[PDB]
DNA sequence: AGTAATCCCCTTGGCGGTTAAAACGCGGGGGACAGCGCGTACGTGCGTTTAAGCGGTGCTAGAGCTTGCTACGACCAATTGAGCGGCCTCGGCACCGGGATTCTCCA
């Protein structure tokens, strides 16, 4: 495959969510996950729908 | 609930070059423009007659207004697929080159 990692900002996942959205993902890293803390965050109601199968935070 | 940092995006600005488009020079041609003569075609004046304008009489079509209701569109909630945003590709149109046909101008 032509990749098995993707790298991407907390400002992309909100900005580019209906091709996030479209997509299934096998694991998902959150990599300062202090960043989702607050519910009202976009970037907390949209990481949340993606469809993945585990999920890790960091923090 | 507020105000400031963070980050995307999209517009403005600068630098280099390259070359295609703008500027410049110069001869000559022919088109703009003033000048002339004529002649016919439009403005003038008169006598003619024609009907537009006014004051007046008569009628009825139909503009304008009210009454009464029911047929038709406004409004809402649930359903769904027609229409939009994103990705792909291949074929139409351009772009080039080269030889063939046309048109232009001086002889």
Known sequence: SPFHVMIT???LVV???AYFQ???WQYM???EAQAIKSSQ???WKCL???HCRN???LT
């Open 55 to 57: 999920r890790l935070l």
């Open 22 to 24: 479209k997509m299934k």
């Open 15 to 17: 900005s580019d969510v």
């Open 29 to 31: 890293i959150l990599d």
């Open 41 to 43: 965050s976009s970037r």
């Open 9 to 11: 900002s907390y400002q």
């Open 48 to 50: 949340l729908g993606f």
